[PDB]
Amino acid sequence: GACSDPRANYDHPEIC
Numbered sequence: 001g002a003c004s005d006p007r008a009n010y011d012h013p014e015i016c
Contacts, residue, residue, distance in 0.1 A: 001013075001014075003016045
C-alpha cells in the first residue's frame, strides 16, 4: 500500500 508512498498516507494510516 502507501508503505512506499507519503501522499496516500493520511494523518495516521498505519505504521506500514
